[PDB]
From Swiss-Prot, chain A:
Belongs to the TRAFAC class translation factor GTPase superfamily. Classic translation factor GTPase family. EF-G/EF-2 subfamily. This is Elongation factor G. It comes from the Bacteria. The gene is fusA. Catalyzes the GTP-dependent ribosomal translocation step during translation elongation. During this step, the ribosome changes from the pre-translocational (PRE) to the post-translocational (POST) state as the newly formed A-site-bound peptidyl-tRNA and P-site-bound deacylated tRNA move to the P and E sites, respectively. Catalyzes the coordinated movement of the two tRNA molecules, the mRNA and conformational changes in the ribosome. One of its GO terms (cellular component) is cytoplasm. One of its GO terms (biological process) is ribosome disassembly. Its main location: cytoplasm. Keywords: Cytoplasm, Elongation factor, GTP-binding, Nucleotide-binding, Protein biosynthesis. It is found in: Cytoplasm. GO terms for molecular function: GTP binding; GTPase activity; translation elongation factor activity.
Swiss-Prot record, chain B:
Part of the 30S ribosomal subunit. Contacts proteins S8 and S17. May interact with IF1 in the 30S initiation complex. One of its GO terms (cellular component) is small ribosomal subunit. With S4 and S5 plays an important role in translational accuracy. Interacts with and stabilizes bases of the 16S rRNA that are involved in tRNA selection in the A site and with the mRNA backbone. Located at the interface of the 30S and 50S subunits, it traverses the body of the 30S subunit contacting proteins on the other side and probably holding the rRNA structure together. The combined cluster of proteins S8, S12 and S17 appears to hold together the shoulder and platform of the 30S subunit. Belongs to the universal ribosomal protein uS12 family. GO terms for molecular function: rRNA binding; structural constituent of ribosome; tRNA binding. One of its GO terms (biological process) is translation. The lineage of its organism: Bacteria, Bacillati, Mycoplasmatota, Mycoplasmoidales, Mycoplasmoidaceae. The keyword Ribonucleoprotein applies. Keywords: Ribonucleoprotein, Ribosomal protein, RNA-binding, rRNA-binding, tRNA-binding. This is Small ribosomal subunit protein uS12.
UniProtKB/Swiss-Prot annotation, chain C:
One of its GO terms (cellular component) is ribosome. This is Small ribosomal subunit protein bS20. Binds directly to 16S ribosomal RNA. Keywords: Ribonucleoprotein, Ribosomal protein, RNA-binding, rRNA-binding. One of its GO terms (biological process) is translation.
Curated annotation (Swiss-Prot), chain E:
HAMAP family: Ribosomal_uS4_B. One of the primary rRNA binding proteins, it binds directly to 16S rRNA where it nucleates assembly of the body of the 30S subunit. With S5 and S12 plays an important role in translational accuracy. Part of the 30S ribosomal subunit. Contacts protein S5. The interaction surface between S4 and S5 is involved in control of translational fidelity. This is Small ribosomal subunit protein uS4. Belongs to the universal ribosomal protein uS4 family. GO terms for biological process: ribosomal small subunit biogenesis; translation. SUPFAM superfamilies: Alpha-L RNA-binding motif. One of its GO terms (cellular component) is small ribosomal subunit. It comes from Mycoplasma pneumoniae (strain ATCC 29342 / M129 / Subtype 1) (Mycoplasmoides pneumoniae). One of its GO terms (molecular function) is rRNA binding. Residues 95-156 form the S4 RNA-binding domain. Gene3D superfamilies: Ribosomal Protein S4 Delta 41, Chain A, domain 1 (1.10.1050.10), RNA-binding S4 domain (3.10.290.10). Pfam families: Ribosomal_S4, S4.
Length: 276, 67, 77, 80, 203
RNA sequence: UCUGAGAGUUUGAUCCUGGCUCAGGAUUAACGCUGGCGGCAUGCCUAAUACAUGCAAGUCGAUCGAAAGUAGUAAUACUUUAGAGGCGAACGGGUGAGUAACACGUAUCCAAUCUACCUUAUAAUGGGGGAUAACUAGUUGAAAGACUAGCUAAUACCGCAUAAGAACUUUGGUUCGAAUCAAAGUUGAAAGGACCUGCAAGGGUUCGUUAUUUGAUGAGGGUGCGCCAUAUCAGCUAGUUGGUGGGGUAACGGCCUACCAAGGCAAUGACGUGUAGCUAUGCUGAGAAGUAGAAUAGCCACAAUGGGACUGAGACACGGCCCAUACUCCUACGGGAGGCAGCAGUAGGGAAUUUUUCACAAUGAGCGAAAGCUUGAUGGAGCAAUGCCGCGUGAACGAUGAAGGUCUUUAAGAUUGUAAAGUUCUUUUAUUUGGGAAGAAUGACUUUAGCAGGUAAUGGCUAGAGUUUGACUGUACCAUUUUGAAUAAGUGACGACUAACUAUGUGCCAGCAGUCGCGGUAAUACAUAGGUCGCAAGCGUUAUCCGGAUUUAUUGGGCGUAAAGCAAGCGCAGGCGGAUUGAAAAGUCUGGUGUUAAAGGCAGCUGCUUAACAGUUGUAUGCAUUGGAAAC
């Protein structure tokens, strides 16, 4: 939604660049300027509808992480990807949150070759191929029980908390808490904090930072003091017990097993069965 | 950028340290540190953020906290 | 590229040829006066000097100086 | 002219065609604001004739500004 | 800036109610103590030249509604003339447009006068004023357009307006005229400007 | 008078010498967090690194022949110019690489030089000749181009005549290396165009041109004076110093040359090295002065480097030539285009320096009697909170203060907090309606009125009427135009220095920080919540400069114990120097004149509603001259 100023037109001939001024219905050229145009954009002068297309292509998506070597070259490579994305809107680049590095996709080996040539010639940034990364979610296996203690004197006053948490993993049902404290071993005011004490800590994994998912946590016993023993003691004890449970349980990893529809003509079918 | 090499202090809790990053510099003076009267800017292309911070948003380059 | 530049270049090539011709016509009569120090040679030299001064090939001060040098020699005779 | 943008202030000066714009000037005639519809030039009309008689003709835009004052009516007859 | 937030906050803290006893009125509490969580008996020993100069300057620029940069700018403008710079500077301050409007009672507050001027409802000598920064001379007239006099609020303010002998008001025609420089007793005596003058060490 | 601020930091405690940091203004600033506008300025100091493309000097047919095409039977009318020739090109544009001295700043002397066109009027614009592009043909040729022979005109070139006037020489005369003037010897100027009138002859209006001749103007040359550091740089210099003769650039000058020589500068510091555009000016303080020499205005020079010559009036010439040098590009490989410190813009650098922008609307420039052509000079617009000014982001009423929070954390309460809940009002802005600028009043074009040597003619001068004159911009701005609190705030800090504090965590771990100095157990010094204070579409932050710092001291310090008397004597140059008498007036003080650019500062005033900004009047200081004074 802006008016672009067409500065000059030019036709790239076999060897020469013929600078022309007028273009009629049937001829094609290029414009100097409009340095922020993206392929697929339509140009309008006499208030006509835009013929912008968005459903004419298919995704060749194959994720491949590209490991960086020098941070300055990585910073320039980010700008290079920004300047090459408009070249092919169907060219895909992901930015993994756990590993903030570029994830190239393409249509095969020659696709990667042309992309790396584009990076290494115009931008002069050359990067070596690494290896892709996967989310690799986490669960674990049942454990007996976990204790948690927190005693301090810092600040001229102590802070005290004792909790017993039994940490139950699942495969389908996410985070859920059940309370079983009876007998005044904890005041009700610190019931809801512990409800938030566990789940907030549940998103940390003891292998590579992958959040722990589909777990059930429960409280059985606990201990506190007189007017001391403020709210944060049990909140931090819950997280400490969660981390200890996740560490000593020898956790298990999960990866998505993608359903693959291999469509082939009636020539490589038996070969497809053999290859699989 | 010059052939000389300079000692600086890394402000705040936490670190963005990889011993390989080009980073900018800041002035100031810290007399406790022997030989260190130069500083690294926190909140630039490197040393990008300090978390939990909601004050002193002139150093540490932390985005303004809003709900 | 400047069209006036090349235009003036092709013009002053010919102008330089003509100026060199007139300068040599001057100098050969100056040599003739150096050989024959008489009134006729001085008159020819001063005529040619005026001809160059008419168009402006030789500045009036330069012409006056050279004619003073020559007339001094003639007066010594 | 000089001054801030959207405020044309052209000080009236005698100009020899060899000098650059608003550079070292021979002698300032006066001051005039084209925006105001009122004669405001500070001219003595005596030194102006001095510059006219010594050559180096100033801008033509002020010649009309001197026809209203009758400078020509006396200049052309003082020429004789 | 131009807005100080709650007006009662400044009045309670600095002990200066712009209205005699309305900005520190019994509005749920009647106290002269500074506001905040530390309301308690304290020993005032830092009250000195630094503290008093800051207090007078802040009260000056908050009652006048002028930002610090503009305040020093007007001080420098006063510096160009000669004489007793304190009293003359205060007179130049009092010749501010919104202050004159407030003294006429045509606007309840200087901020209300600023709103009236900026929205463009004040006419000065064949020129409508849009910037609430105008210095009036003796014999300078202020008009309110027929469009801007239809409001019950402005009429109520006019009927309960401030009286000022140094200027002439025609309430039946909504006309104002800056007659003369206000005398010393006609100026607010709350603030002593000499300390603020000594606060200028930029010379 | 312009006009003056300090505090802390050594000790058990006290004072003194000194240092350090803070307290404030400014940027050719930038970073970090945010982010509304109007007005205005500013926006590569690094790589004078390399740089694609468009512009950055073009113009003249009333200069010329000819060439082509639209009409016309042809003739001729109509449109353009490829070339020659003419003017212009050396100025504008941009940088500070280099330049340490008449480069810069300033006054004279040029009896040492010139200046096309502008200003001064006068003699004249006489008669001939030859070629020459353009054009054609042939050759080398892919073109690019180059070579060869004919064809053509000129305000293009070349003889001759007239040359009052001019240059040169001689005789006389003026005056203190030169002046004015009488006669004589000698020398040399060109071209017509266009228009009108007239049968013609001829005459007239303007332009083009030569000669002569007034200023103004630019450039060049000499001059005293001041105009960076540096002695941990004592000799430097060979056309150098000077003379005779000659030649030479506008001139005098070893400027150059033939001959004869021996000095010249030089401890009042030359020479050497580093650095460097300078000045007016920007900032700082009252000032001595320091700071920076953004833009700007002038001066200075190169244009990738080292050189050279030509045209031209002026160039060794931003985008002229040639040569040598480093590179790109094309090449058919034979050879060629060459050089964005012009407007831009990009590769890279850095903190960073921008549209690959409009029109020449206006001024100017270049040119042409002209319609007028070009103009990335010039004036606007775009981006960026880089900076300054203004401006909103609401206002009135509404509580022993709603809710919640924070705190004593009692079953008082305070606190946020007229903030709010909520009711009215209100539109700069968000938003449609209408209206709509000043800026040509620049000039020219067409008509008329008067003017003049001339009037036989139109042109030359002044007036009046109509024609048009914008890139800007339906912009600014205005009018109950409509709806509307709605459309817009973050920032730093609270132990003290220096106004602004309490709670939780914290255990010398984290971390704070400009200093004193804080934190190894109730931390007002840290991290967070709340409160509070100060600024604000900006806040902090660093770099850097002036003040404080008089803390390199004529103004403005000392040398016995905090730093400091050569170990003493002799002593040059130089500095300082008794009085009386006389003179002079060099310093000194004063009167007058001219210069010391504009802009800037200071004071007064004017306008864009108003600050910012622009403009007007007065306004120092120094220089030289004239005249006074003799107290030193």
């Amino acid at each position: 939604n802006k008016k672009e100023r067409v500065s000059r037109l030019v036709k790239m001939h076999a060897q020469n660049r013929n600078e022309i001024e007028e273009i009629r219905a049937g001829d094609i050229c290029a414009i100097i300027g409009l340095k922020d145009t993206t392929t697929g954009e339509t140009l309008v002068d006499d208030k006509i509808d835009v013929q912008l297309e968005a459903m004419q292509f298919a995704q060749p998506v194959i994720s491949l992480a590209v490991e960086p070597k020098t941070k300055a070259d990585q910073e320039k490579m980010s700008i290079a990807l920004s300047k090459l994305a408009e070249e092919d809107p169907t060219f895909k680049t992901f930015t993994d949150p756990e590993t903030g590095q570029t994830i190239i996709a393409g249509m095969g080996e020659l696709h990667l070759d042309i992309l790396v040539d584009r990076m290494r010639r115009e931008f002069k940034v050359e990067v070596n191929v690494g290896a892709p990364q996967v989310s690799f979610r986490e669960t674990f296996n049942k454990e007996s029980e976990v204790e948690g203690k927190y005693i301090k004197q810092s600040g001229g006053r102590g802070q005290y908390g004792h909790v017993k948490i039994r940490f139950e993993p699942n495969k389908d049902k996410g985070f859920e808490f059940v309370d079983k404290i009876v007998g005044g071993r904890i005041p009700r005011e610190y019931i809801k904090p512990v409800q938030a004490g566990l789940e907030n800590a549940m998103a940390s994994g003891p292998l590579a930072g992958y959040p722990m998912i589909d777990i059930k946590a429960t409280l059985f016993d606990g201990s506190f003091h007189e007017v001391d023993s403020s709210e944060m003691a049990f909140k931090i004890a819950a997280s400490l017990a969660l981390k200890e449970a996740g560490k000593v349980c020898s956790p298990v990893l999960l990866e998505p097993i993608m359903a693959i529809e291999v469509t082939v003509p009636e020539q490589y079918f038996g070969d497809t069965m053999g290859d699989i | 950028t010059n052939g000389f090499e300079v000692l600086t202090y890394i402000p705040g809790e936490g670190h963005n340290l990889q011993e390989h990053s080009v980073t900018l510099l800041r002035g100031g003076r810290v007399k406790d540190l022997p030989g260190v009267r130069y500083h690294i800017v926190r909140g630039t292309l490197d040393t990008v953020g300090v978390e939990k911070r909601r004050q002193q948003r002139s150093a540490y380059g932390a985005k303004k906290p809003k709900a | 590229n400047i069209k006036s530049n090349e235009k003036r270049l092709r013009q002053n090539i010919k102008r330089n040829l003509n100026n060199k011709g007139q300068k040599t016509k001057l100098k050969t009569n100056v040599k003739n006066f150096h050989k024959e120090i008489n009134l006729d040679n001085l008159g020819n030299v001063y005529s040619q000097a005026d001809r160059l001064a008419r168009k402006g090939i030789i500045s009036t001060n330069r012409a006056r100086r050279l004619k003073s040098r020559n007339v001094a020699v003639l007066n010594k005779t | 002219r000089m001054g801030r943008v959207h405020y044309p202030t052209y000080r009236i000066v005698a100009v020899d065609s060899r000098v650059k714009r608003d550079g070292k000037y021979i002698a300032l005639i006066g001051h005039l604001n084209p925006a105001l519809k009122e004669n405001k030039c500070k001219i003595d009309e005596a030194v102006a004739l001095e510059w006219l008689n010594k050559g180096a003709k100033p801008t033509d835009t002020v010649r009309s500004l001197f026809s209203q004052t009758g400078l020509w009516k006396k200049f052309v007859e003082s020429k004789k | 800036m131009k807005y100080t937030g709650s007006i009662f906050k400044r009045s309670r803290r600095l002990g200066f109610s712009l209205l005699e006893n309305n900005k520190e009125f019994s509005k749920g509490k009647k106290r002269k103590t500074i506001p905040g969580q530390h309301g308690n008996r304290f020993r005032s020993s830092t009250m000195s030249g630094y503290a008093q100069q800051l207090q007078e300057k802040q009260r000056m620029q908050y009652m006048y509604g002028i930002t610090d940069k503009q305040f020093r700018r007007l001080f420098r403008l006063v510096l160009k003339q000669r004489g007793n710079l304190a009293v003359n500077l205060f007179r130049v301050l009092e010749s501010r447009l919104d202050n004159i409007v407030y003294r006429m009672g045509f606007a309840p507050t200087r901020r209300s006068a600023r709103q009236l001027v900026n929205h463009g409802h004040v006419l000065l000598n064949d020129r409508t004023v849009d910037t609430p920064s105008i210095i009036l001379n003796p014999g300078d007239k202020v008009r309110l357009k027929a469009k801007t006099i239809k409001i019950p609020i402005v009429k109520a303010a006019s009927e309960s307006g401030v009286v000022s002998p140094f200027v002439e008001t025609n309430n039946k025609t909504f006309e104002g005229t800056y007659v003369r420089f206000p005398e010393r007793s006609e100026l607010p005596a709350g603030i002593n400007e000499s300390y603020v003058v000594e606060w200028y060490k930029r010379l």
